[PDB]
Design an enzyme around this catalytic site. Structure first.
Site, PDB file in Angstrom:
ATOM      1  N   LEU A 127       0.738  -1.257   0.000  1.00 33.27           N
ATOM      2  CA  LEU A 127       0.000   0.000   0.000  1.00 33.27           C
ATOM      3  C   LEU A 127       0.773   1.317   0.000  1.00 33.27           C
ATOM      4  O   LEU A 127       0.834   2.016   1.007  1.00 33.27           O
ATOM      5  CB  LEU A 127      -0.987  -0.026   1.174  1.00 33.27           C
ATOM      6  CG  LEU A 127      -1.737  -1.364   1.254  1.00 33.27           C
ATOM      7  CD1 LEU A 127      -2.602  -1.374   2.497  1.00 33.27           C
ATOM      8  CD2 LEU A 127      -2.587  -1.589  -0.004  1.00 33.27           C
ATOM      9  N   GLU A 128       1.334   1.663  -1.150  1.00 40.39           N
ATOM     10  CA  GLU A 128       2.078   2.904  -1.294  1.00 40.39           C
ATOM     11  C   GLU A 128       1.173   4.109  -1.059  1.00 40.39           C
ATOM     12  O   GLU A 128       1.591   5.113  -0.484  1.00 40.39           O
ATOM     13  CB  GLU A 128       2.678   2.994  -2.699  1.00 40.39           C
ATOM     14  CG  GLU A 128       3.995   2.272  -2.872  1.00 40.39           C
ATOM     15  CD  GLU A 128       5.147   3.015  -2.226  1.00 40.39           C
ATOM     16  OE1 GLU A 128       5.698   2.510  -1.234  1.00 40.39           O
ATOM     17  OE2 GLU A 128       5.502   4.114  -2.711  1.00 40.39           O
TER      18      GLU A 128
END
Ligand SMILES: *[C@@H]1O[C@H](CO)[C@@H](O)[C@H](O)[C@H]1NC(C)=O
Ligand SMILES: *[C@H]1O[C@H](CO)[C@@H](O)[C@H](O)[C@H]1NC(C)=O
Length: 274
Positions: A127-128
């Site tokens: 989850l950037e």
């Protein structure tokens, strides 16, 4: 104190020139292959899988082949792109349903299965991008409840691949707070000033491992020997590996990625230090 585990997780799917999934498992270099990425999902019900042009027609067969050789295959969702989010409990549950019916033990007439009857072994959260409004905690809990060890189903390895810096972004922290993640791959090869192989990763490693006692931590390394964060095998042997393994919850080494590893044969030596 921790110690070697012999575990090596590698990412696959970022470059079609890296060979098939079957080839990766047949190398004998990995104990887990994580495909990447399901890069589009959200509150609108639209989902997309991006395997960079790889021939999807043979993936299902390759997955089952990998599993027959004792190499589980996982699916990472998210990535470096901007086409995903999970802004509500409802969107989180819809994504779980989509994953369940498309890649795991679910079956719904309206939902096609990209890999046919293949049933994946896990889900990784890369989850950037995220906001405090995201509910990855809801998705994580539902996935964890389907990790069955003693009943109708199979184990589901729930993991997260995070940035080196501690503490993590709020949306990641919210998900990890559930305490049910099995493994976390700490990327130490990003250019992040103050937190990478050149400087600061050890301090962050201390904080990460201490904060989540129930989770196994993997040191994420790049197999791209051109990277400024690449660690020569000798420095992994005398430095990185020994330092990481001092923690009781050390789980192994994560490698990015099959493409680079194929060109450098990095894991040929690294698998012995993991
Ligand atoms: C969403 O799920 C979380 C965790 O289960 C819960 O705390 C929250 O109340 C839920 N939101 C609502 C009220 O739908
Ligand atoms: C690593 O081994 C492979 C075996 O096929 C070889 O092709 C490759 O050239 C080696 N790595 C190097 C030095 O490029």
């Amino acid at each position: 104190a921790g110690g070697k585990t012999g575990q090596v997780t590698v990412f696959w799917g970022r470059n079609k020139a890296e060979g098939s999934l079957r080839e990766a498992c047949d190398s004998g270099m990995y104990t887990m292959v994580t495909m990447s990425f399901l890069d589009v999902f959200g509150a609108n019900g639209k989902y997309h899988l991006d395997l960079s042009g790889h021939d999807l027609s043979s993936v299902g067969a390759d997955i089952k082949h990998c599993q027959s050789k004792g190499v589980p295959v996982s699916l990472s969702i998210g990535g470096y792109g901007t086409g995903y989010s999970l802004p509500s409990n409802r969107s989180a549950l819809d994504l779980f349903d989509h994953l369940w019916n498309s890649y795991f033990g679910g079956s719904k007439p309206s939902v096609p299965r990209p890999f046919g009857d293949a049933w994946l072994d896990g889900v990784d959260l890369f989850l950037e991008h995220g906001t405090p409004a995201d509910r990855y905690d809801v998705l994580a809990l539902e996935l964890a409840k389907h990790n069955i060890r003693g009943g109708p189903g199979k184990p589901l390895h729930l993991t997260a691949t995070v940035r080196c810096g501690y503490p993590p972004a709020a949306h990641v922290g919210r998900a990890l707070a559930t305490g049910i993640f099995e493994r976390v791959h700490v990327r130490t090869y990003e250019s992040d000033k103050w937190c990478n192989q050149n400087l600061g990763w050890e301090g962050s490693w201390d904080k990460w491992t201490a904060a989540y006692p129930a989770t196994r931590f993997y040191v994420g390394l790049t197999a791209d020997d051109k990277s400024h964060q690449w660690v020569h095998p000798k420095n992994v042997y005398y430095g990185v590996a020994p330092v990481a393994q001092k923690k009781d919850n050390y789980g192994g080494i994560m490698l990015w990625d099959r493409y680079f590893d194929k060109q450098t044969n990095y894991s040929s030596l690294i698998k012995y230090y993991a």
